[PDB]
Design a protein around this ligand. Structure first.
Ligand SMILES: O=C(O)CCC(=O)C(=O)O
Ligand SMILES: [Co+2]
Length: 350
């Protein structure tokens, strides 16, 4: 009937080889470009830089840093998070080893069912919904890590042969970090330390996303990953070798997210914004490319169980305090998120 072979994009790592212009499907309209047309993409983030010593989170001055960071930016760097540098280095080395393999080897894990049907899990790109869609300058391998009995290990790279063990160990380590952050948030919001852990639920999704950003000859014309907020409750992000690129939006201004060696980045998701009545909000963020080197990151997305109603916590609505978000089942929120200027969560504000 009709040819829709534009739904099947070639990996950017291939398209980026040796080019001096970005192919047209990556080029943003002038007013949408990182510097809107200029070479100045972002402002340096002002002090105090949002940094949280996770081992000292029970101390009041550290809790005050976490609260200040979440109010101001919706994210923070974490130090002393309990994840050994050797394991952070190895999981990102395993990722680099996978992306460096031949296209043939990587497409054995393709997220294009039968070579044509997008699904989220596997190696490739995000869904192409229309011919005129501007694509991001990245590829990604995305894997469902939790619940354990829902994993499809056929999409997990078999080479290098320690990829699976490294990801499993790392994910179990980021779950500890997740819970420590969530307990500190329940405490500062006076909701109980286990409030958000229980809202999220024992079988909640945890998804690993290994991002690969090839060098781009014209970083002013494309996004490595387009402006967005994460949809779940909390994201724990690891950037290999702290290569720059990540930026965060605040009051319409884009700020470079600074790096610290051996740290992780925690950012809130939209589901958390609703659950906490907007006290802390989900930050809009993006990745700009560079001309010199590839950039690798690993995001651990912690979602909320699908049938949980997302709604402002009851403890935040005492004393006739008004709800600022309509309620919505978590699976319904994700569905609305994947629909096509205005972010979906704006439709829920009251
Ligand atoms: O690569 C990064 O630093 C950001 C990744 C990100 O925003 C995402 O995968 O949702
Ligand atoms: Co993100």
């Amino acid at each position: 009937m009709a040819d829709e072979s534009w739904r099947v994009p070639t990996p950017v790592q291939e398209l980026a080889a040796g080019v001096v212009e970005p192919p047209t499907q990556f080029v943003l309209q002038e007013q949408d470009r990182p510097g809107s047309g200029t070479l100045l993409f972002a402002t340096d983030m002002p002090e105090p830089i949002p940094v949280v010593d996770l081992s000292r989170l029970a101390a009041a001055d550290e809790a005050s840093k976490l609260r200040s960071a979440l109010e101001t930016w919706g994210l923070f760097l974490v130090t002393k998070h309990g994840i050994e540098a050797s394991l952070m280095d190895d999981v990102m080395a395993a990722s680099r080893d996978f992306f460096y393999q031949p296209l043939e080897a990587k497409q054995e894990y393709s997220n294009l069912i039968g070579g044509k049907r997008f699904q989220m899990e596997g190696y490739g790109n995000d869904m192409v919904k229309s011919k005129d869609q501007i694509l991001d300058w990245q590829d990604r391998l995305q894997l469902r890590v939790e619940p354990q009995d829902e994993r499809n290990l056929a999409y997990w790279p078999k080479h290098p042969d320690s990829f699976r063990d490294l990801l499993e160990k790392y994910a179990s380590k980021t779950k500890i970090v997740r819970n420590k952050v969530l307990r500190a948030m329940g405490k500062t919001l006076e909701l109980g330390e286990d409030y958000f852990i229980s809202q999220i639920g024992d079988r909640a999704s945890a998804i690993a996303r290994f991002n690969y950003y090839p060098p781009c000859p014209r970083p002013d014309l494309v996004f490595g990953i387009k402006p967005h907020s994460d949809g779940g409750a909390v994201t724990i992000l690891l950037v290999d070798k702290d290569v720059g690129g990540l930026q965060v939006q605040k009051d319409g201004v884009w700020y470079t997210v600074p790096s610290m060696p051996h740290t992780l980045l925690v950012n809130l998701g939209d589901s958390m914004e609703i659950m906490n009545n907007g006290i802390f909000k989900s930050p809009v963020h993006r990745v700009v490319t560079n001309a010199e080197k590839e950039r690798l990151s690993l995001a651990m997305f912690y979602g909320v169980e699908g049938q949980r109603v997302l709604e402002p916590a009851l403890g935040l609505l005492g004393e006739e305090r008004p709800a600022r978000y309509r309620k919505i089942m978590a699976s319904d929120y994700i569905i609305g998120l994947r629909q096509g200027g205005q972010r979906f969560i704006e439709t829920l504000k009251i």
